[PDB]
Each structure stands twice: as C-alpha cells, then as structure tokens.
Symmetry: D2
Subunit: 339 residues, 4 copies
C-alpha cells in the first residue's frame, strides 16, 4: 500500500564469515540456510523483497556482533575498513535503493572518527551503526563505552559531518554472560538482553552529558527504543525529582523528554505492535519514530504487512514510513520517494 518506505536497521555480512554467520543464525533464526543467503545477498533477494513490499530505500549496516566482537584493535580496525570498502562497492549496483552506515572499530575515538569521516567523505555513507560496547582486553572481557570525555572527539565528528549514530545491540559475553545469562540462555538477544545493553549505553550518554556537549548529535535506537519509552514517566520523575537534587544535574542539563525531542530517535525494527507504536507516539512523538525491519532477523512480510495495514492516521504513516528519514538523512530522490 504505502510505497517508497525507508528501512535502516538492515544487516549484511561478509561472504568470508560464513561460519560466524551460521553460528549467530543458530541462535536467532529458524531457517539458518535462508538466513545465510539473505544476510549475504545485497542486490537480488533483498531487492525482490523490497519490490514486493513498497520499500524504496534501505540504509545497510553490518550484522551484530560485528566489529564490536573483535578485541584485537589491529584486527578490528582492518575489518571495519574492509567492510566499508566492500559495502560501498555493493551499493553501487543500486544507489537509488541502497545507502550504508559506517562500520567502525570503537577501540580508539580518533581512529573511529577518521574512519567515519572516510566513509562519509569517500563513499557518502549516511552515519554509523555500532553494536553497543566494543569488546576489549585480554579475552575480550572488557567493554568500551562511549559516554565519556574521551569520546568527545568522535561525537564532535558526528555533528560536524551531521550524520546520526545508530546504537544497535550485541550479545552478552564473558563474565556478564556467565553471571546473568547462561542459566536463562533463552533470554539472550531480542527477548531481553539486547534492550538491556542499548538502554544502558544510551541513558549513560544522557546522564554523562554527551547531548549537552553535543546538542546536535542524533542517536537512533531500534526496537521502539529498547524499553526506554515505557519508563519515560518514571525516569523523568527519578531524574527531575530525585537524582538531580543529589548530583546528576552537574552532568545532565536537560530532561529525558528534552533529549527525546532533540537528540534521540526510535525505529520500529522487530516490534510490529500498533498498540506499542501508539504508546510511543504519546511518549516520544511520531516525528521521532522511523520505520525499520531488522532484516533478515525479521521478514519483509512481517514488518511491511504490519505497517502497511496498521490502523494509523495518514499523516503519521507517511512520516514514520519515509518522510522523517528523508529529512533526517537529507535524502535525494529514490525509488517511489514521492509515490
């Protein structure tokens, strides 16, 4: 029904990582062979799905856990460069159907900034997509978070290039996995652990002043915001009426509602619920919500049959389906972009 939709939590993997791809698919797919074919394909199967379901344009990104799983910084940086080079070449086949997010090693802020700059300047990438914290340390058991002053040089690069950063989840690993998840392993991923990671990281950016030092920074969360809109009232209450009387205001200058109006976006990836969408329109606003799919972990059919048929006023179907993203990513014409 609606044509020219934009999706932007849409993953690919390098052909040479088939064994890693099959392992991940053994956790999160019920048809691993199709999953492998679909996550590797760019220009045939993905285009067929999009043509069947009114998706004009997709911004592609590297699969989780991706480069954030790599704790050797030399190996991680080389892989990020190789991935960005590769997808830049694949999207040349269909530039009116595909863009790309930068894939980054996040071991070092300046290095990440320089690779993001190369991606935007050399290839016209639309932003960065990063799978939560960067694994680091001896067995990759440490975690690099980006909500501190060391990362100001990276966030300033984001706003100077004026591109958003998509904070995608990754799986729990090492000590955190063994202590919290190994004994309830079915909760790993979309059921719970993914949202716990992303919400921690983004609310860390909030409470550590990232959006105060970088008020134009745009951060995107999938899965209708990784629980955060559910607690909008409760977070705001415990910030404004409690923690900001105790020290939080020193590093957090606006309300959580301000940051959702000015800095934070949510997408519909993997959360095809009109009831939850309506609640998010109340708590976050339709201007800040973007359609997305989470392919190939989710199907085009599921996401698009939901969104195309959901009961929704026409103004917001148009905005969430494509017009919000057209403005955010400064998109020129693409297939059915005005249909």
């Amino acid at each position: 029904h609606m044509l020219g939709k934009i999706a932007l939590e849409e993953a690919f993997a390098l052909p040479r990582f088939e064994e890693k791809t099959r392992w991940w698919a053994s956790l999160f797919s019920t048809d691993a062979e199709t999953h492998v074919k679909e996550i590797t394909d760019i220009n045939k199967i993905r285009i067929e799905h999009a043509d069947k379901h009114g998706v004009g344009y997709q911004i592609l990104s590297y699969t989780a856990p991706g480069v954030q799983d790599i704790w050797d910084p030399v190996e991680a940086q080389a892989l990020a460069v190789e991935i960005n080079d590769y997808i830049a070449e694949q999207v040349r086949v269909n530039p009116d159907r595909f863009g790309a997010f930068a894939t980054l090693s996040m071991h070092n802020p300046k290095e990440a900034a320089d690779e993001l700059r190369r991606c935007v300047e050399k290839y016209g990438f639309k932003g960065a997509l990063v799978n939560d914290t960067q694994r680091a340390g001896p067995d990759g058991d440490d975690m690099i978070f980006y909500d501190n002053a060391d990362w100001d040089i990276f966030w300033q690069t984001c706003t100077e290039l004026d591109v958003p950063f998509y904070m995608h989840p990754r799986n729990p690993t090492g000590t955190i996995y063994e202590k919290l998840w190994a004994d309830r392993k079915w909760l790993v991923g979309p059921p719970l652990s993914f949202a716990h990671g992303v919400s921690l990281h983004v609310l860390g950016m909030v409470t550590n002043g990232v959006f105060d030092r970088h008020p134009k920074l745009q951060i995107i969360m999938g899965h209708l915001g990784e629980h955060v809109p559910f607690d909008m009232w409760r977070i705001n209450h415990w910030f404004e009426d409690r923690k900001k009387l105790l020290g939080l205001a020193e590093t957090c200058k606006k309300t959580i509602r301000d940051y959702f109006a000015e800095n934070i976006w949510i997408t519909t990836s993997g959360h095809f619920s009109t009831t939850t969408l309506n609640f998010c329109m109340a708590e976050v606003g339709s201007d800040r919500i973007l359609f997305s799919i989470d392919y190939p972990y989710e199907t085009f059919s599921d996401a698009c049959e939901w969104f195309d048929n959901a009961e929704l006023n026409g103004t917001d179907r148009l905005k969430i389906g494509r017009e919000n993203a057209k403005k955010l990513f400064k998109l020129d014409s693409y297939k059915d972009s005005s249909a």
Copy 2:
C-alpha cells in the same frame, strides 16, 4: 476520593540499621531526616498519610537491599527471623490497617520455605517479598537465582500456602556494579538498574519452567512490570515464532501472555502515569494490576493524588484500587474496605 485502597510495596527498616538506612537514603532520598523517620515509623506517620489519602490497608515489607544483601547464611537467616518477629509485633497495634509480607534469607530453598511457612501459619503474613537475587559467596560477589529445580520445594510451599511472592529489586553490587554501572551511576535504582534485575529474574522463571511445574504460583512485579509489558509483543514474537522452534518449548509450555494471565501481577508502585497504565491495561489487563505506592521512596501524596484523580473507568479504578488485592490476598474486611 476513592477510599479503602490497598498498597503493597511499602517498606520499613529496623531502628538498629540507621547507618545503612542513611547510606541508602543518600542514594534515593532528597530529605534524609524525613526518610529515616518515615521508613522506621509504622503506627503514627504511616497511618496519618494513609488517613489523608484514602489508603485503608497496607501490606508492609522490609526495605531493600535487606536480607538479600547479607552473604553469610547464618547472619542472613537470623536477620530474617528477627525482622519477621519484629514486624508481626508492630502490626498487631493496627490489624485493620496493616498486614505483612515475609522477609526471607534465600540462601537455602528448604530454609526459606520453612520460614515462609512459619510467617504464614503463625503470624498470618500475606506472602513473601524478596529483593531479587540473594548475595552469596565469600565476599558476597555471587548471586543466587530462584529459577531452577532446587527451588521447587520453595515454590511448592508458596502454592500450598496459596500466597504470592513479590519480586522486588535491589542494587547492583560487586563485579556487575563495577563493569556496568559505576561509570553511569545515576542510572542505579529506579531509572534503570532495578527493572533490569527483576525482569531478568522473572523471565528466567518463565523460561526455566517454574510456572509449568507450579501453575498456581503468583509472582508480583512493581513499577508497572519492570519494562516487560512494553515488550509483550516482541517477547511473545521471539518466543512463539523463534526460540520455541529451537528448544525453548521443552522447558516453557505456555505463551508469555498466558503467564501474565495466570501467574504474574504488576503494581503501580513508583510509576504514576495514566498513559502507561492504559498501555498496561491493554498489554496485561486491569484484572492483573494492583495499586501500590513504594513508600517512603515515593510519597502518599504523589501516588494517591495521581490515582484518585486519574481518568479511568469506574470498574477498573475499583479493581486496581482495592478489589483485585482483596481477592488475591483474601482480604474481606479492613478500614473503608466497602467505602
């Protein structure tokens, strides 16, 4: 306006723990002197609040982190016994206004079962309230979860006594605190960390078959369900359409919506949002929602002015305000119970 309300996430502390109380207050209270007085008081300040705001009956419970902070099992068990004996004596002063939940050391399933039984049979306590996992190990860095077969003896005691179990949060400690929370410490507690703990534990009970082995067991979550209602669609989708095709169905026989209809309850503690309440009525149903306050971390005025004045149909205001709890806790007569 509505009288005879029942609240059941209402904390007290022992006078002799003032030093620990003042530390906890330094994290979660903006008026430490009033907090110390209010968390210790049972029969004067608490009654005055309840009289001003139409609260007929309160089921009291021990503050967090409580006994779950105590990793020496002998010390933890002695403190639980002391607390239960203490509160039983305190609530005899005003039995038409107060009941109590059992406070438990959860180091050993049979020990916890025996102390719950003593509380119910000797004192007429209404169930148990436990602050998430039990700290254990030589310096308290281990965590005891209850979503496994060792705890069958305990859960069968809950269903044999036919009393509910309230899974309350507690703070992150030790390794988990240092790795995830120390660099974003303003998120500890109500903003984020509390719900991450309780939702993990309760969904662990779901996916490890606790409610299949104990289909009559009632589990209560505060704070409108610790994010879980937001992801009801997404959890159900990733169970029924994904993980249940990969092995989860072998230890998880019903849908997440079944378990919320049959086993799980949520309360309004610390989440005084009509918009979110309405969304929870859609996702879990008004029959499964209980009024509560979270005093003295929240005020009677905030909780009761909100709920008394919220826009709500008369049927559900009556159920959520008192009639759901009257049925669940078999409370037929107390102050203003028929007002």
Copy 3:
C-alpha cells in the same frame, strides 16, 4: 485461535419479506444475492461460518428496521408474535448453538412487557433487541421513545426477568430524514445516523432517570457504544460540573461513568478496530465489552479474523470473546464454551 466465542448482534429476516430485505440490502450490502440467502438462513450457512471461525453460540435477533418500522400497532404486534414463534422453532434445530432475543412491538409498554415475558418464560429467550424508537402516528412520522415513566412497567419486567435490552439502531424516517439526511444520504446507517439515534435514546434513559428507577437494568449498545465512549470525559464534565447544578440532578442521580459500570454494555459489532477497542477499555472497561459481529451486514471473516488475531492480553480476550456474555446471559454450556 479462540474458540467458543459468543456473538449477539446477529440478524435474521422472515423469508416472506424478500422485497423489504432486498431494499435494505440495496443500502447496506455489496452482494444482495448472498445477503438475502444469509439473512434468511438460520441453520446451515450461519453454522458453517461459526464453525470456521470459533463462534460457539449466537444470540439471534430480527433485522432492522423490523417491527419498529410498523406504525399500525395491530400489525406491529402480530408481526412481533409471528417473528418470536418463528425463531423459537428455528433454533430448536441447533439449540446448543443458538439463542434468541425477543422482537417487540413498542407501541404500548404493557403489551411489550407481556410479549417479552412470553418469550423468556415460554421460549427461554435471552432478552430483547429493539431498533431504537417505534414509528407511530397516522403516517408513521411520530417516534415513541422509552425514556419516561410510561415505560416503568416495561423496564421493571426486564429487571424482574433479569434479562438485558439491546438498543439497536434504525434508519431515519419522515420529517427527520427530510430535514437532516436527505441531502447527505450516504451518511444514513453505519457512517453516522445509526449512532446518532442510539446515543440519543440511551443518554435520554440516563438523564430521565431510567437507571435510577431501575438500577439493575442492563442496556447493550453495539458499534463500541455509538460514539458515547469518545465523549465520556466531556459528558461527565458537562453533567457533573454544569447541567447537574442547573436541574439535571433532579432526574439523574449517578455519574455517566457509574451508569457504564452498573447498567450499560457495549459490543464490538461493526467496529473491528483494536485502537478504538483499547480506548474503550480505558473509558468503559473490558468487563463491560462484548464480542459481536453484526452479521450479515459484516462478515464472520472480518469480525473473527480481527478479534482472533488482535493484539490483546489473554484475560480480556477471554472476557470479551465469551466470558462476559456467559455471565451476563447466565448461559449453560454450549459448543467449545470452555475450550
């Protein structure tokens, strides 16, 4: 997937009225030949639809405008008796699958009470369904409303038998049609005029004290309550804060929300909207909402595919789909009634 659902705004017509049936189908059906077959059939097509869509029990009623279109009181009364005798015979073919509402001439309160009593006592009918006001006067241009003291004997009969009254719509006629609807005739029926009639009549019962004189009276409206839940706040405000300080309190002793908690029910007939259902759960409460179809003006497929697949908590799906009506109509077991 839900089985054993109950539908209760489900119409039939006498075979001898083929022309009036075809005229009415010319306004409200896109397939007149199927409509004629379906509205006259009781025991084959209707059962086939129900078996395919998990409907265990249907309470049948006479099509609109039905007896309310007949302004000759002798002819009106004879037709009502004919219809009730007819449908009582028809449902004995499949008594486990069907009940019936009484069809009444509403020219005279005593006469209507006596025929309602005959239907319930002799045939075990479940209540009455009436298509808004009774046409009367020499050319049928008068309207008999039931919201006055003349009808106390009729409303007392409903409460004595403890059976509900379904206020179904009918078309505008005569002077009202000419002045308001003739020049915008596409609005006649479901788009607007139907709800305008029913809401006027039921809110007249409210404001003329019918539910004060008969506080056990149960009144059912289809189509999610004929606009009334949308204005629950506005009606309550203009009653309690305005009209009840100017004279309304003399004949209206409770609030509009009280009457929806105690007296008024709404059904999902012809309004297969989860968004509007959720709003109705907020403003009226799931305890007061009944599944229904509006067959054969709506299809089993539309109503049942919607309800079976709607995002809804399991508690309220069970209540709205059957358990509310099972209690309201004191039903014995029927096909799949506890499936």
Copy 4:
C-alpha cells in the same frame, strides 16, 4: 509552564444583547453574572486569564448561536457586518494578543463570500467561524447547509484567501428540537446535540464532494472532532468497503483518512482528556490537532492546567499548543510566541 499558547474557539458577544446572553447563560453557565461580564469583555478580564495561564494569542469569534440564529437575511447580514466592524476595533487595543474570525450571515453564498473577503482584506481576519446551519424560512424552521454546489463560490473564496473555516455548533431549534430533544433537554449542547450537528455537516461536506472540488479547503472542528475520530475505522470501512460500491464514489473521491490528513483539523476545546487526546493522536495525528479552550463556557484554568501538565512528549505539546496554529494561520510574532 508552556508559554505562547494559541486558542481559537474563544467567544464574545455584543453588550446590547444582554437579554439573549442571559438566556444562553441560563442553559450553559453555573455563574451567570461572571459569564455576562466575561463574554462581553475583550481587553481586561480575558487578558488577565491569558497572562496567568501562558496563552499568548487568541483568535476571537462570535458566540453561538450568533448570526445563524437570525432567519431574516437583511437583519442577519447587518448584524454580521456590525459584529465584524466591532471586533476589528476591539482587537486594535491589544493587536499582539488577539486576532479574529469573520462572523457571517450564511443565507446567501456570494454575500457571505464578499463579507469574508472584506474581513480578511480590510481587517486581516484569520478565517471564518460559523455556528453550523443558518436558520431560514418564514419562522426560522428551515436550515441552510453548505455542503452543495451553490456554495462553491464561497468555498473558492476560502481557498483563494487561503484561510480556514471553523464549523462551530449551535443549539437545535424548532421542529428538530421538539421531535428529538425537548423530552431529553439536558442533552442539548455539549453533552450530545452540538456534536451531532457539526459531525453531520462536516461529513456532509466530505460525502458531497466539497473537498474534492476545493482540495485546499481547511475546515476546523472543536471538541476533539465531534465524535468523528471515534468512528474513523467504522466510517472508513462503510465508505470504502460498502457505500463506494453503491454510488458514493461518484461524489467522494478520497478516503475519510485522506480528508483528515489534507483538509480537516480538530481542536481540544471543551475536551480536556489526555486519554482521548492520545486516541486522537492515533486516529488523526498530532499535526492536525490544535489547542483551544471554548472560553468562557470553559475556564482558562481547566483548559490550561490540563494541557500544561498533561503527560505528553515535548514535540507534540509544542505543536498542539502553538506551532500547528502558527503555521496554519501564518502568524507573525505575538507575546511569548517563541518562549
């Protein structure tokens, strides 16, 4: 809290009509002496209210029933001209705080079009506000509707000037009053009759092709859309799936959702319900919703304390409170317009 709000369903009356003002107040006010002073006051009481409640700009309109109550066309036209001349002079006192809608005699399309043009071109009025149908005929028992081709010249003037038309309610009179309302007179006005008139007229414009012949025409409804959003699903279903197979497609070329996205606006006048606002945000979209009060039938305190404190994302509070109206009415700066 929010400053610079815009309200635009705000009524005044001429001092020389105090008798008629007091009669109207006897129906819809509980404090007649205050009502009389407030409905005639422009620059003192009205300004003090707005200063205390963060209202920067108000578009004023003549009270109901106003000129639509006058069935003598010479008398009606003279009064419209007098009222427009009067209010243009009155708003000169505080031009940064007030604008005005044109008041019109709607007996004749060209005459009304010419007076609207005079008001816009000579006085800078912002549009027209008309109280539903125009009384006409020998005793005023006829009604002039505007949903027909005779009114094309008027609607073309609206779009040529690019100003909106506010369809305000009026009381039922004459035969309609006697047949439908006299026996349930407490439903007259806000409880029911008002919405029945406006929804009929605007959905008449929809189904008689007014918005097809004049696709730039902007129509405003108060009271969150006079029931129409509640039935958006049902109207759309009975248009697209029923009536448009029987002839409606010949005079109605878009869906009802298209007309709410392109032509129709709703305001919050007299409907201070966050639950209903949230539902209207789903069904109509926050871009199409305007704050308003309905003063002095509603109080600034009721409307503004509600809206200032309602739980709502910051994006939509800004748009609904002022930014939607700033763009629709092409406003220059006014008090607190960018605060």
